[PDB]
Symmetry: C3
């Protein structure tokens, strides 16, 4: 008995105050920062949700409530590793993941290798199983007007029974 | 010969008039309702499309035309079961599904268990094979301004030949 | 050793000037055209990214830079076949693809069969492995206001080792 499972995640955060932003674990210089209870790290959030979705464990909002102040300013990589620990406790292993950052700016391409390192590390997998890409929406929408950043992820999990 | 197949669906409806809304089959109280030829049930629509997409049967607009008044006010669960019947007639069985509601409001979390019951029932599967989650877009976009609700779904089908 | 891999792609282009638009390789009559370095063909772009994502080869922006004028006005089908050649050189074969055009107008349904022919041809597969669908966002958003067209795609690749 070998089971394969598909998952999908989507997240948005608004720009706010200032600092760098944090995306896929990488600190990226930018005129403004991300408003969140959190890292605001939309890439890891969308990814975490894709993983929980494939395991039918719900999503980050269920596992890590807005209400609990133990998650205020939390490293989104902590959340990813925690979510992943539980996924593994139900007997799943990683097939592969693919992430799509939707942002007008800043440039994501230079930071993609480092994101993959962080993600592969956090998921205890080889980098070959992690893909991250970016698209701009050509000045259209809330993304295109520089009001915020959106991100999607899909994930494939494997489970042996065997 | 064992074939696995991936599918994706996306849907949007605008808020309009009033009543509850219907999302994933669940009647959810809200100041306004959903404008549609239909349930307006964006969750089941996006899901139905994910399923038809994986089976290469097109989408709901092809199977259930806007033009046909036999679908006016139709229970979107009827459409889901009908779409699923045809999917099964081509020899597919369910692997798993994952759904992402994108809405500023109302709160989706309390209603998610009941949605999963409805979906699992409609697809003749165990609840373990159905995941539903929600994300807000933090007041950004048409979703964030409370103008409507969007939803995504991914699906994995299996086919034995064998 | 048999490996299955999931990928996701998303693209947007703004309407601009005039002419037909090109979507999934098909020339579709419309009051306005698509602004791009390219075909502007959002369907094939989102699809190309889904395929590269599953193979962990990045995305079109990495393979085919905005900076290189060898891609100005390029047939997006050339890019798809090139991206696919490289995917195959890493030893992958096609499982299936599913595409979702998000557009208020023009009507996509009549052109879907011809898109599938083009895609199946370009990917050297049977049409049964290619699905394309469309959704409108009911006048909501940049899509709903006729400012541009968005598209999503998911893809499943197979690799034998064996
Ligand atoms: N319309 C919505 C939108 C989001 N949600 C869930 O609320 C959680 C709040 O914290 P989170 O980390 O953003 O995850 C959110 C969704 O689970 C929800 O229940 N209904
Ligand atoms: N730009 C678009 C958008 C949507 N469509 C299809 O039209 C169908 C109308 O009813 P439906 O149930 O929304 O599904 C729609 C798409 O199939 C389309 O053909 N072109
Ligand atoms: N915020 C963004 C958005 C897009 N990108 C990448 O830039 C590339 C430009 O050409 P392309 O064909 O649109 O692909 C883009 C993304 O790879 C990026 O690096 N950062
Ligand atoms: C599943 C997904 C990704 C849904 C998109 C949700 C979002 C709020 C889009 C509307 O904003 P917009 O930027 O497209 O339009 P506008 O700027 O006019 O509000
Ligand atoms: Mg999407
Ligand atoms: Zn988030
Ligand atoms: Zn609908
Ligand atoms: Zn493009």
């Amino acid at each position: 008995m070998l089971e394969m499972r598909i998952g999908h995640g989507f997240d948005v955060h608004a720009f706010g105050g200032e600092g760098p932003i944090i995306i896929g674990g990488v600190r990226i210089p930018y005129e403004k920062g991300l408003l969140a209870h959190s890292d605001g790290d939309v890439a890891l959030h969308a990814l975490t949700d894709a993983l929980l979705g494939a395991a039918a464990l719900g999503d980050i909002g269920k596992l890590f409530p807005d209400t609990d102040p133990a998650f205020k300013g939390a490293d989104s990589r902590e959340l990813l590793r925690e979510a992943w620990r539980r996924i593994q406790a139900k007997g799943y292993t990683l097939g592969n993941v693919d992430v799509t950052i939707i942002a007008q700016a800043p440039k994501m391409l230079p930071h993609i290798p480092q994101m993959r390192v962080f993600i592969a590390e956090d998921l205890g997998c080889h980098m070959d199983d992690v893909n991250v890409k970016a698209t701009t929406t050509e000045k259209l929408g809330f993304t295109g007007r520089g009001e915020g950043i959106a991100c999607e992820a899909v994930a494939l999990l494997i489970k042996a029974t065997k």
